[PDB]
mmCIF file with all atom_site columns, C-alpha atoms in Angstrom:
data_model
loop_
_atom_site.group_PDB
_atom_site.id
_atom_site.type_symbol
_atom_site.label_atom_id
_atom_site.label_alt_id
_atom_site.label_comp_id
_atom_site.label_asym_id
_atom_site.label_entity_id
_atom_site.label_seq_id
_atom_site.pdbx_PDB_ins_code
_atom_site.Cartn_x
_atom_site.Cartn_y
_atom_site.Cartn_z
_atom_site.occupancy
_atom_site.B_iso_or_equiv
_atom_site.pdbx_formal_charge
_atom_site.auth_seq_id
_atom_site.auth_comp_id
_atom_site.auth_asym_id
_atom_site.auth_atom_id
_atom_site.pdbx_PDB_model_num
ATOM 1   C CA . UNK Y 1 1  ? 14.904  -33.069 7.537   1.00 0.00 ? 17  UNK Y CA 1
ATOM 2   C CA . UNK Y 1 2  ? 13.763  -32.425 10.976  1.00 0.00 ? 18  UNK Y CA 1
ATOM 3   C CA . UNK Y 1 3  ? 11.081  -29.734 11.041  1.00 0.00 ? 19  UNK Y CA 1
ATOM 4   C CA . UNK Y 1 4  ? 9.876   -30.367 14.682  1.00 0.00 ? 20  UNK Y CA 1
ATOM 5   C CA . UNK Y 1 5  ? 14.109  -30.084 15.099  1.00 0.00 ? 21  UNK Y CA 1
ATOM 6   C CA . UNK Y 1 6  ? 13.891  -27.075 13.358  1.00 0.00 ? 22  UNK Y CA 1
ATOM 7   C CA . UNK Y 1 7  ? 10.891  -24.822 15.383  1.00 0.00 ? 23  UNK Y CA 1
ATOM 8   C CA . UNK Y 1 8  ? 12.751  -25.538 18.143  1.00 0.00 ? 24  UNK Y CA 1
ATOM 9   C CA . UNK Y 1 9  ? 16.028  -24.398 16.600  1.00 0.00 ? 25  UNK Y CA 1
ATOM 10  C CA . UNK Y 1 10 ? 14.561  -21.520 15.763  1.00 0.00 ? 26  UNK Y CA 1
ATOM 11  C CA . UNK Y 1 11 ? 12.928  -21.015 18.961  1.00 0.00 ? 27  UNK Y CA 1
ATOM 12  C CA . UNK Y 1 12 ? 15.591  -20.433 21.509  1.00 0.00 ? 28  UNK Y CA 1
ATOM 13  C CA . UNK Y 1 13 ? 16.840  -17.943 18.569  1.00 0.00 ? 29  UNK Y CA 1
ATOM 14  C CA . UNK Y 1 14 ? 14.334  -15.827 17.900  1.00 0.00 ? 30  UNK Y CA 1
ATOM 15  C CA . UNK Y 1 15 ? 15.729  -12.608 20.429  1.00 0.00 ? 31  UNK Y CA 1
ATOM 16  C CA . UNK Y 1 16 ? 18.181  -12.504 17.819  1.00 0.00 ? 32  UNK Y CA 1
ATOM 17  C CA . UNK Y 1 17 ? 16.047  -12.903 15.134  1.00 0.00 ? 33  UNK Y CA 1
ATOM 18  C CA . UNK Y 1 18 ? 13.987  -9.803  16.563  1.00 0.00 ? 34  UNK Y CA 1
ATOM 19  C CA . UNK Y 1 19 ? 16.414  -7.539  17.216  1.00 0.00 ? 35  UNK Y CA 1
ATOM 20  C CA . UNK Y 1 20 ? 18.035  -7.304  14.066  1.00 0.00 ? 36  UNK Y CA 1
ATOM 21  C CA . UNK Y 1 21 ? 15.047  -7.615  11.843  1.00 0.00 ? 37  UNK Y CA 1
ATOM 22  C CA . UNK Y 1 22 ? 13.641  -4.385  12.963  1.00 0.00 ? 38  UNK Y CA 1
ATOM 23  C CA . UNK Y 1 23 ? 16.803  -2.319  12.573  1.00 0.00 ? 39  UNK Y CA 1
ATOM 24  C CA . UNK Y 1 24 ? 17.413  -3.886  9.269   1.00 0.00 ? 40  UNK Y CA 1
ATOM 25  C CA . UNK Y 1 25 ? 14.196  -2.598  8.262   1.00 0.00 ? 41  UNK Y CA 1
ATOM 26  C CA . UNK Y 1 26 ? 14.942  0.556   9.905   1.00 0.00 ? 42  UNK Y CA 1
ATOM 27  C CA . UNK Y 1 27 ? 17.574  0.746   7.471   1.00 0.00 ? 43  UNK Y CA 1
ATOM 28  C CA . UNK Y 1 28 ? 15.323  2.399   4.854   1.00 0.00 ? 44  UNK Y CA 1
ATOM 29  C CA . UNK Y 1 29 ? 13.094  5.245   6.028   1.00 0.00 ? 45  UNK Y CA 1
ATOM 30  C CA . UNK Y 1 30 ? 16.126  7.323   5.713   1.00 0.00 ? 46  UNK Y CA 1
ATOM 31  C CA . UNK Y 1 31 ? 16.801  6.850   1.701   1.00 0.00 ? 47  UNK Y CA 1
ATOM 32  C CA . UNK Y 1 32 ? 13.253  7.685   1.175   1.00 0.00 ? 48  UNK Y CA 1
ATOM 33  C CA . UNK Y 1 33 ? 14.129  10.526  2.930   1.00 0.00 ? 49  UNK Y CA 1
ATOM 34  C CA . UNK Y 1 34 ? 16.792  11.231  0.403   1.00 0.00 ? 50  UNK Y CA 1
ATOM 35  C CA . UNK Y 1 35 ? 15.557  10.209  -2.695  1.00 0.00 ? 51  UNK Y CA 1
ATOM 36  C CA . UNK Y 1 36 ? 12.842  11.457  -5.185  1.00 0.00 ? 52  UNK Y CA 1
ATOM 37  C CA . UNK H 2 1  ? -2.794  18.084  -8.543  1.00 0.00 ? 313 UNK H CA 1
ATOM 38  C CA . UNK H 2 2  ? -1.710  14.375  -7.723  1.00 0.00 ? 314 UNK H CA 1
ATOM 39  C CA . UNK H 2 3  ? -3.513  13.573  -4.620  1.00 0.00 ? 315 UNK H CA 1
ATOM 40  C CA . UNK H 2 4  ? -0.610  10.865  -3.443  1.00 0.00 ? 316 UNK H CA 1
ATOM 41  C CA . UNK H 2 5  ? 3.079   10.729  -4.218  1.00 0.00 ? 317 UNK H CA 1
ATOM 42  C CA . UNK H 2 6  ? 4.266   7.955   -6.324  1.00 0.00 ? 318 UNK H CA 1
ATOM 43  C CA . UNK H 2 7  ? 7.639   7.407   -5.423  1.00 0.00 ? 319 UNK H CA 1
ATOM 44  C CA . UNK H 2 8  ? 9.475   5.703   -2.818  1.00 0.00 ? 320 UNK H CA 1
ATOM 45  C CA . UNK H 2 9  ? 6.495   4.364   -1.492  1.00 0.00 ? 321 UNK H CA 1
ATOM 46  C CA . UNK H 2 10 ? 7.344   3.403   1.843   1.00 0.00 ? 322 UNK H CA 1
ATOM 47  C CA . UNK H 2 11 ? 4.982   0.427   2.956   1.00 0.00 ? 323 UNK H CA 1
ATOM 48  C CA . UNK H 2 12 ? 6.379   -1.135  -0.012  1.00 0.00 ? 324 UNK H CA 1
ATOM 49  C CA . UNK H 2 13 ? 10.226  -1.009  1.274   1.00 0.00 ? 325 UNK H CA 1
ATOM 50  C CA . UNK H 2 14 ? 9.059   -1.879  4.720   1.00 0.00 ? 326 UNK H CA 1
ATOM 51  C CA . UNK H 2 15 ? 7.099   -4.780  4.248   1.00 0.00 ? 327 UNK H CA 1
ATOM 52  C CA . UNK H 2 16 ? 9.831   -6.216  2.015   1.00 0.00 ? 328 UNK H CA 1
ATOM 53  C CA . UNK H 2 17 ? 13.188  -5.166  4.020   1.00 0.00 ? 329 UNK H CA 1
ATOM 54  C CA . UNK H 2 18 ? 11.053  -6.316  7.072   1.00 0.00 ? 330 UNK H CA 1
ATOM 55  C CA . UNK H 2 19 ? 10.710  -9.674  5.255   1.00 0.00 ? 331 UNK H CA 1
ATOM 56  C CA . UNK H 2 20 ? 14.274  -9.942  4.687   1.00 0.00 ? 332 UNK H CA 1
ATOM 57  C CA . UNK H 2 21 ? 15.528  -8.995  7.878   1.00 0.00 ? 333 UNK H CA 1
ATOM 58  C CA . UNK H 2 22 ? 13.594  -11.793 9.137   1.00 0.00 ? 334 UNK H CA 1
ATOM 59  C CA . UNK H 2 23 ? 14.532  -14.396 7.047   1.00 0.00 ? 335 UNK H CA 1
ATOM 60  C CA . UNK H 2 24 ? 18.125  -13.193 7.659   1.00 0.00 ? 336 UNK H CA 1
ATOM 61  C CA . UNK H 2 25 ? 17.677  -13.440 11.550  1.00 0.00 ? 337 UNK H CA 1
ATOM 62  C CA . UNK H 2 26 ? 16.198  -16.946 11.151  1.00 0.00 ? 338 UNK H CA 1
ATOM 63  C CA . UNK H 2 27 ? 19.388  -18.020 9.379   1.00 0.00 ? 339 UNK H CA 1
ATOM 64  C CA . UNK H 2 28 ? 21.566  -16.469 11.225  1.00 0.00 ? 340 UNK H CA 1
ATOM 65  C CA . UNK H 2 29 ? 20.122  -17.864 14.598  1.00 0.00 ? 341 UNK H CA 1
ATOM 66  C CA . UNK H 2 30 ? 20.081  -21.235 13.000  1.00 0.00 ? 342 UNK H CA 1
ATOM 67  C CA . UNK H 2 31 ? 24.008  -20.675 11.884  1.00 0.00 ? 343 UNK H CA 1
ATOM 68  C CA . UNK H 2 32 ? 24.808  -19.769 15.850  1.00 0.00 ? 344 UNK H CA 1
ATOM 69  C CA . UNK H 2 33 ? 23.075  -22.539 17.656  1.00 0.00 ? 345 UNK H CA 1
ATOM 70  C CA . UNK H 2 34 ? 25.596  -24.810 15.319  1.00 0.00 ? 346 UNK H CA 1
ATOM 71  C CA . UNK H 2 35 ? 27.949  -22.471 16.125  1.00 0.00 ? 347 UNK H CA 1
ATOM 72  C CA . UNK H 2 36 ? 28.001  -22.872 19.803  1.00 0.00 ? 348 UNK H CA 1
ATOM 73  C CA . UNK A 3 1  ? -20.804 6.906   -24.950 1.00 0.00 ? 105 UNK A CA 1
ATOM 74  C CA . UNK A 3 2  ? -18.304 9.604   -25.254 1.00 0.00 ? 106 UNK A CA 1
ATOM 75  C CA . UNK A 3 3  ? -19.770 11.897  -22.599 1.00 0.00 ? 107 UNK A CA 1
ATOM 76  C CA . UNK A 3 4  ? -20.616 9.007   -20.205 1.00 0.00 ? 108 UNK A CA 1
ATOM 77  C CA . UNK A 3 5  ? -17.285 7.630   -19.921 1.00 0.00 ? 109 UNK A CA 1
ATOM 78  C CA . UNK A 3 6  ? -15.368 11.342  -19.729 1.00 0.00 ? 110 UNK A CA 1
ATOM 79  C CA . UNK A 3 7  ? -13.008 11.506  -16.878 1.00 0.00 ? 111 UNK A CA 1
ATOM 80  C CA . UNK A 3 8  ? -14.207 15.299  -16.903 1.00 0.00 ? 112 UNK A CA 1
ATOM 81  C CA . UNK A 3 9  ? -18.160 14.851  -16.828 1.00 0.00 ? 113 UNK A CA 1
ATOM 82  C CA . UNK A 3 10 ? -18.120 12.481  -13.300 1.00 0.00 ? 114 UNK A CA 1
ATOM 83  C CA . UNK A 3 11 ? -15.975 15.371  -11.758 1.00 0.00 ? 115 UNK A CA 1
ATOM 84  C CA . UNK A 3 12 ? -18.467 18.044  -12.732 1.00 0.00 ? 116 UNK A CA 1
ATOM 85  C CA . UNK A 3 13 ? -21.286 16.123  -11.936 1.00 0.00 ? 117 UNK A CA 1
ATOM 86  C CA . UNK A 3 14 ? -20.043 15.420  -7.963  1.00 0.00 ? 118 UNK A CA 1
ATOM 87  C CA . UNK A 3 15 ? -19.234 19.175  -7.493  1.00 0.00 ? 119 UNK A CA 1
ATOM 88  C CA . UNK A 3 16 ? -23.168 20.063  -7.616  1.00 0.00 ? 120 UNK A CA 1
ATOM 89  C CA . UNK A 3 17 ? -24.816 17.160  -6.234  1.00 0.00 ? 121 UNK A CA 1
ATOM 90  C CA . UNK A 3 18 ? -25.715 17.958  -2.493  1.00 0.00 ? 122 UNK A CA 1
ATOM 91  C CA . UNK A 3 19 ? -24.613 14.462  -1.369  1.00 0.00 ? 123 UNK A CA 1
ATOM 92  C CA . UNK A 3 20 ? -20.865 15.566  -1.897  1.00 0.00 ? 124 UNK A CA 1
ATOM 93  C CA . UNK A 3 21 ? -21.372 18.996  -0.173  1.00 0.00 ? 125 UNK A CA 1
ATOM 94  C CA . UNK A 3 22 ? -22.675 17.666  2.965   1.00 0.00 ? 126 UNK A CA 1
ATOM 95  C CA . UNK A 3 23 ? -19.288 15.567  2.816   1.00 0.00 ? 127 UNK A CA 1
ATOM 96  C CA . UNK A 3 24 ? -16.936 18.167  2.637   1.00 0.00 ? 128 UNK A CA 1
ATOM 97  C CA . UNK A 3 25 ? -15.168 18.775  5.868   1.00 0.00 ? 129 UNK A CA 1
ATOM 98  C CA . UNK A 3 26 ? -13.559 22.051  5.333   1.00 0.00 ? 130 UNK A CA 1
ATOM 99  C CA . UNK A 3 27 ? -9.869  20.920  4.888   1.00 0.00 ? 131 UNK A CA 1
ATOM 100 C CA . UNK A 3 28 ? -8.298  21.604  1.190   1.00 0.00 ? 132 UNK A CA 1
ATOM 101 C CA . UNK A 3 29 ? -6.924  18.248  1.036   1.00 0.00 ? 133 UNK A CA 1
ATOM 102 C CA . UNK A 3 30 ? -8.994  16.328  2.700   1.00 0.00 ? 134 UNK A CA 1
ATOM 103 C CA . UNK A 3 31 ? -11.820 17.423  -0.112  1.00 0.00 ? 135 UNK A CA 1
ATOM 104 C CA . UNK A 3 32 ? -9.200  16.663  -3.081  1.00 0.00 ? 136 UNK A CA 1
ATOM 105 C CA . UNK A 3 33 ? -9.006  12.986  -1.678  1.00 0.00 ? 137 UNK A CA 1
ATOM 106 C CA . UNK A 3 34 ? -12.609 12.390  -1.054  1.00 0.00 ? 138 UNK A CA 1
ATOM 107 C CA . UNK A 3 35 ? -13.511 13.543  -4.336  1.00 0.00 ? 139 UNK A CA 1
ATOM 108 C CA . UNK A 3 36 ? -10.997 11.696  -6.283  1.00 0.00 ? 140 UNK A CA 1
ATOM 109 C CA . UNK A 3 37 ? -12.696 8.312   -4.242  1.00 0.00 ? 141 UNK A CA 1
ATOM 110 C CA . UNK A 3 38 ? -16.064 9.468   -5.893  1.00 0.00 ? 142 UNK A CA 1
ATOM 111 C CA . UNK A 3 39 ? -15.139 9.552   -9.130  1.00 0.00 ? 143 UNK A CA 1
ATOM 112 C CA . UNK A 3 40 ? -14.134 5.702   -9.558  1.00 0.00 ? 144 UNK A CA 1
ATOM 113 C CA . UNK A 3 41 ? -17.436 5.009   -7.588  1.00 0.00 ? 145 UNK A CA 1
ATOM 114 C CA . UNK A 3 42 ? -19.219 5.257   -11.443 1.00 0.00 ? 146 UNK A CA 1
ATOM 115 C CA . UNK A 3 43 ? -18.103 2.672   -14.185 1.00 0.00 ? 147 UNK A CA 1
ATOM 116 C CA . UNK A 3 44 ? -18.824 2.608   -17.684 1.00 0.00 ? 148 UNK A CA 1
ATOM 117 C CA . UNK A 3 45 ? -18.671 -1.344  -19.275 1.00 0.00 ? 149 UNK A CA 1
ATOM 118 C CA . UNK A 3 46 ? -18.712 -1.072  -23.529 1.00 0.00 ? 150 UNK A CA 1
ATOM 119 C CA . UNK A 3 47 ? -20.914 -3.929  -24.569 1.00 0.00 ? 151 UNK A CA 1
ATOM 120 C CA . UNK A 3 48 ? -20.338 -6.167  -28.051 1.00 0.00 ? 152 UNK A CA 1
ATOM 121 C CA . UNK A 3 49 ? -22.861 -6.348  -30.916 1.00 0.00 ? 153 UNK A CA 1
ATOM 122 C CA . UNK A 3 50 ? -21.406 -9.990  -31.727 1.00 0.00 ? 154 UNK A CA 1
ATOM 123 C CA . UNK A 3 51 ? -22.445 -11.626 -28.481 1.00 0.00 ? 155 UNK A CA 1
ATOM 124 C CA . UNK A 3 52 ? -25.286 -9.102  -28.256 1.00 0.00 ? 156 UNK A CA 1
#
């Protein structure tokens, strides 16, 4: 495996990594709103 | 009288959909730089 | 023992103590929290007569 390959995978990615990972935890604070 | 509510205990479900979300981006960033 | 480890004698024994009154900021649940922090600030440790 290539991990210095892989950082900079990861790199050029990470505005979609960003964008999605708040809105998927954004997700919830809604069903605690509706639960218990 | 409880002083604090038990249940859904937010920081809880944030810190771990948060987690998620991020791992998920990371993959999926990873699955479109192959993909383009 | 019984007394010393009673959930019920640490929370009289903070209501008429003046180091919790001078604490109290006048808001009904802010006083319920604060007081609830006092009472795990004493704890009782049951000792063994075979290790004396």
């Amino acid at each position: 495996l290539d991990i210095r390959g892989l950082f900079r995978t990861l790199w050029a990615g990470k505005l979609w990594i960003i964008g999605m990972g708040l809105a998927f935890a954004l997700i919830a604070l809604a069903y605690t709103f509706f639960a218990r | 009288e409880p002083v604090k509510r038990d249940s859904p205990r937010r920081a809880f479900l944030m810190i771990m959909w948060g987690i998620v979300g991020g791992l998920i981006g990371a993959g999926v960033a990873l699955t479109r730089r192959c993909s383009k | 023992v019984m007394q010393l480890a009673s959930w019920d004698t640490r929370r009289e024994f903070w209501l008429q103590t003046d180091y919790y009154k001078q604490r109290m900021v006048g808001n009904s649940k802010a006083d319920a929290a604060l007081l609830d922090e006092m009472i795990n600030n004493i704890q009782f440790i049951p000792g063994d007569f075979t290790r004396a």
